[PDB]
């Protein structure tokens, strides 16, 4: 019952490649990612207003 005592927290958000390229140093392994399999239609857990 205390948010401070929590060990972890997980959030899922929508992002595009330009956002990741804004800070090229911070992110790695961008070329291996595939964009078709990870999509809002393919992931049912994510809830969003995007068509």
């Amino acid at each position: 019952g205390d948010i401070n005592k929590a060990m972890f927290a997980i959030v899922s958000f929508e992002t595009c490649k330009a956002d990741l390229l804004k800070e090229k140093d911070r992110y790695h392994n961008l070329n291996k990612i595939d964009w078709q399999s990870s999509a809002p239609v393919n992931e049912p857990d994510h809830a969003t207003t995007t068509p």
Binding site: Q36, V41, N42, P44
Partner: peptide
């Protein structure tokens, strides 16, 4: 009455491979 989960099991859209190849010439 029953407790529907309200998730709507749906099937996604099948891929297309020939169409991106083709260039389009306007009429």
């Amino acid at each position: 009455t029953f407790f529907w989960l309200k998730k709507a099991i749906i099937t996604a859209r099948k891929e297309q491979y020939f169409m991106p190849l083709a260039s389009v010439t306007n009429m």
